[model samples]
Target: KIEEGKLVIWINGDKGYNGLAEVGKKFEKDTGIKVTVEHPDKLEEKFPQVAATGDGPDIIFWAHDRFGGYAQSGLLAEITPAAAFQDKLYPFTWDAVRYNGKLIAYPIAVEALSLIYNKDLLPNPPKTWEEIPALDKELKAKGKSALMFNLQEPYFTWPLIAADGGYAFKYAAGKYDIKDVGVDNAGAKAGLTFLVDLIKNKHMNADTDYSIAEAAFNKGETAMTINGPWAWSNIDTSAVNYGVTVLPTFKGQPSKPFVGVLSAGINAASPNKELAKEFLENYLLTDEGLEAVNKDKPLGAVALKSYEEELAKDPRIAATMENAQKGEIMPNIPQMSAFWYAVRTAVINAASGRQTVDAALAAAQTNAARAAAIDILIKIAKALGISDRAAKILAEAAKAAGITSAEGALRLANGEYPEAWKYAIELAKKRGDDAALAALRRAF
Candidate 1:
């Protein structure tokens, strides 16, 4: 009612919103609520500013990664969609959107890595990591690669990481046991060998990345590569007859892809709450509307079971489902603020043969923990607006530690020498920094 029977929907990126906006017209036609849309670049960067002013749009189209931070910040509107509608979403859909115990967003699409192969070249693509070694020579004979994916990113390499027995958390009881980090285990450590061998033997190279590899794949220069559904926009369908499969095995164990979701949420400050809910339930939840948004997006979206079944008719989308079934949903948690950078380092180090499994895992653990701790501390400090002295102390400590913030924090926690930390705390001292102080104390 407050929207004057109109809804403002802010969506991210440029191309993705067009299809949705076309479908948005139906929402207006059916509900008599005009759906005005805005497409903004770097919505996440701008969202905090807009939300802080209490002017967030009625609906937002984006991913789940930032949801946890926003939820913790109280920018999220709790999803009040009834249990029936909630239950319609597939696995990890709810998991990715929920923060702590609250649902913050509507699950839209699930995307995970899959083996993309040029069917003309690889009629029967290698099915396991172990099989690729044998095919390298054959593939090269035809100017093709057995496999090519970006190693610089942990996203595509996660299947390999999981093949080694590494996980960010031991997901159990429908929650991540934060204390039970799995990256440091022997399983992940052993998988490092397989990863190193691929690049080491020249089957793949450190320089080869997603865009380059995808170019090779579409040009028939590569037989098999790894990518998600988003790769569709880049590939010329007429030029290459491609088929999708779940990732190959690390030796014999299944490589678990990381399921990253693209979804939408309502801003807590929206005036058109009920209409927005109606828009989603009636229009968005339908096959036609979702199909419009999902038309060319990589990775099959399985927001609902019916949609999942319908999309499964396509081999590629079906493969995305199979891949996701064997994957872990990217944890949408505040701790992830530091998690990706730390994990990326470990993956890159292991793949490049820069470090051994034991050393790499240890580094990852230390880095992730340090980053997590610092993220909490900084958030608290910003909220408290500590003294400039404390700020100088924090900066000096950060500089004097001779390491990244995460490593420095870890070193400080281990009783390594540092007086800059004192200055940081001093800035907060007697100035109502108890919350931040407590946070730093907990980290140290």
Candidate 2:
């Protein structure tokens, strides 16, 4: 089933295809292997369907978040780069592509939130949250606020909330403990309360959403705002003298933003896994290869710091990298979808003064945990072909038995919820529910 001397790659857009043009040409010329590059419109949806049939591309380019699902489904080949090459890139790059302690992809580029400031107004950016008030006072005379950002968006606010000891999940030894969410912890409360005070004091506008904040900064109405690399084009167009820097410290500790990486990985279904690895290790990771791939969209955070000249060329990129170095990789687990909504609601509630910060985060923790648990419960129910009624009964039983966390839900799938299962079966029989009883038996 091997496809000899041929390698296929799926990218998401024309810009990506054109970006890799020179690299592909050189790869073919050097290795005598034909390279077919594609810009498939629905790559995320199509890649999984094709890979399940052993007919996907030899390699694929996608954001690191997609790797977790691909690897969990056995769609991606476990890859190992030369240790020297691994050391060449930033450490957090690997954090994105690793799934269950396996390297599922190699990082290509990275991005993270940063403090973008007007250099003309503040020659030196604040190093800590305590210094922001002073900066705000200076800017107040000029009819400007010191800071403005997407106040209600968790992605932008997470750095501040997590700057002390707050976190979405407990990440340790390359794995996340979904059972442990730290957003409502004391450190998290401290961070959130700080932002609330800023809003109440009118130092930071509660109405400054992403667009409004970005526009205000571009128009030089704010001395500083938290943002990411994607805003560079507009900032450049505005021609307001600005600089990007790492987020200020909160509680004497550096802020931790969510770093996202774009990465490349081999398809497990491809017969040419070794060949594709050869392309990545020997060809695609080279200086020329890295440069060519970023031709269309200049990299803000190059994985390989060996490309120092490029970083030096753009101070903004350098700042982005510095911030990423201090940041944590965004969680790539499927549960992260629930996390976004839960945290977003908490952020909105706290930022709008509708709820106390502590109350909002406590709600976030509970909602996110329940959502993840229910999602896993549904999957287990589907696998067992249980009736919806039976599933509902089991869910309630499990909840009573303390199956509120993702870990507990996973244990339930492994048939560990004895009391819950027994209760569900008993309830079905007691109600004379033959359908529920039959479905429960399948799982039991």
Candidate 3:
């Protein structure tokens, strides 16, 4: 049943609101269904809480990456595009919206990291990572570096790590196998070793972050940066003449960045699901509708195949799309939450010389696997009618016993206590939660 009188959407940013508001006006004129676009604060924090209660907007304008958790939690409705529209959108954008083989959102735009360089500083950008060292030497007398960015940020550094055959998880048959982590493989070690060399040789500052790198790029202090189209708005307002292009190849292989998709998805619990879908399919996906959307703000690289011709007129968007062709779709699995922390720690530890690249990544692999296992155990606990607190306690006990995998967690729940488990078990008993302790053992 479609809700009558109104259609509501929750989104962020003034530009997105204005653009959608324009389309909403046209929709109301055509169907007499008033469209309300809300720019809500704390949207990321509030949406899941409100939606879990069977309440909230009919639609949400957010990135496709976020939909994995939402779809897994049953907060988002599956949406299949019409046959005519299905083949007309970028296939990879479709990949981003799918979780466990079900389409969960309608993609509108795409973004990926690229080489953004100062045209005045280096008119000819290097085509390979090897050329960067030579370029850095030439800029040495000028007190400038060849490149700079958030050195420890995994999102920004993933392209380097992805060189050769490295990856956080093994993807096959349209799904990711969380157990087959590959971040510590020889391929990843090769990429991370290069980054460690950059820091050791002083080619780039280890202290750099997004703001610092952006500021340096703005002032022409750095010749180039690896960043995404989102950085354009601020850089466009700056005096530095810049150009965007595909990242330099590492050892003859392409540096594959993670391509992100921005999309609009319907709420599963919305009373206006049919109406929301109608508004999205018949209005939002059309050229006229998208023209209005871009009328207010630039959509970095449009995902609609039909819109590509016009969007390509801008070189930056064209380059982004080109880079995206060689990039992997950012994994949208809920399990990816554990990857960030592990990878970030690896980067920081390796870059700071506290640990070798191989050691850091190996440690990261262990940490991510343990975290993913605990995450699964938590879900199992919930299914067994146990509280999250009890599940965490069980996980902690298992970890203290040097048992980090879900199998080991199960072993602990089944009363298999190693020598180390004695201390952890006693500690848990001292907390005085006898009921939780009993429930943990009963759960398995």
- Local accuracy by lDDT, each model: 0.71, 0.80, 0.79
Which model is ahead, 1 or 2, in terms of lDDT? 2
Error of 3 at 78 (Å): 1.6
Tell me the lDDT of model 1 at 88.
Answer: 79
Instruction: Write candidate 1's Cα lDDT for 105-157 as tens digits.
Output: 88888788899888888898777888888888887886667777777877777
Candidate 2 at 397: error in angstroms? 22
Strongest candidate by lDDT = 2
| Regions of model 1 farther than 4 Å from truth | 1-4, 295-299, 372-389, 392-444
**Candidate 3 wrong stretches, greater than 4 Å:** 1-3, 370-444
Residue 193 in model 2: shift from native, Å? 0.6
lDDT of 2 at 73: 65
Candidate 1 global TM-score: 0.82
The superposed Cα distance between candidate 1 and the true structure at residue 234, in angstroms, equals 1.7
Write one digit per residue (lDDT tens) for candidate 3, span 1-444. 335557988887744678888889999888988899988875744565467667788889888777776776677888866777788888888888888789988988888999999999999999888889879999987988899988868999889888776887888888888899978888889888888888888898778899999999999999999999879888989999999998988878888898888888888988877778889888887787787888787777888888877888888889999899888888776456578778989998888888889889888987664456566666766777887767777667544443434454455555554432444445558898777767654553
In model 2, the runs with Cα more than 4 Å from the true position are 1-4, 14-16, 308-310, 370-444
Q: Show the lowest summed lDDT stretch of 10 residues, model 3.
A: 400-409
Error of 2 at 235 (Å): 1.2
lDDT, candidate 2, residue 342?
Answer: 88
C-alpha TM-scores of all predictions? 0.82, 0.82, 0.84
